[PDB]
Design a binder for this molecule. Structure first.
Ligand SMILES: CCCCCCCCCCCCCCCC(=O)O[C@H](COC(=O)CCCCCCC[C@@H](C)CCCCCCCCC)COP(=O)(O)O[C@H]1[C@H](O)[C@H](O)[C@H](O)[C@@H](O)[C@@H]1O
Lengths: 54, 55
């Protein structure tokens, strides 16, 4: 016998969308954090960059 | 003799007998049996599983 599910001539398909993974709720109990600092404000952390343009 | 043989054989073989369908492997849809799940089964919804080449 042939397996019940085979063959699909119609519905050509579509290009898979760009994957957008989600942060792990199971593996991480919370949200992973980067730079550590006192940050006596709403929160900036130990990482702050900037690009000075012309 | 029949009861003792039954008990002894069952106690001998029950150590070996294991349920193939005990949900053990974690998955986004809760723990599932081993046969259903492989390394490609997302442990949590939306997990990224790269097709890593094995150098
Ligand atoms: C005449 C005897 C009448 C009794 C029939 C016995 C068969 C019915 C079993 C009833 C118990 C099932 C419900 C509770 C139990 C349950 O859910 O367990 C299951 C597995 O059932 C077990 O326990 C062990 C099964 C017993 C072996 C029976 C051997 C064959 C018999 C029928 C032939 C000898 C009798 C004499 C006739 C021949 C005469 C000679 C001429 C699955 O295990 P699992 O959930 O994965 O956990 C694992 C743990 O079991 C596992 O021991 C442990 O070692 C782990 O590895 C673990 O992972």
């Amino acid at each position: 016998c042939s397996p019940p599910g085979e063959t699909a001539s119609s519905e050509p398909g579509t290009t898979p969308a760009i994957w957008t993974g989600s942060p792990s709720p199971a593996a991480p109990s919370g949200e992973d954090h980067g730079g550590g600092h006192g940050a006596g404000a709403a929160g900036a952390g130990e990482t702050l960059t900037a690009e000075l343009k012309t | 003799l029949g009861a003792f043989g039954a008990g002894t054989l069952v106690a001998f073989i029950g150590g070996l007998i294991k349920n193939p369908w005990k949900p053990v492997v974690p998955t986004a849809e809760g723990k599932k049996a081993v046969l259903w799940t492989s390394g490609w089964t997302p442990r949590f919804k939306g997990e990224t599983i790269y097709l890593a080449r094995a150098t």
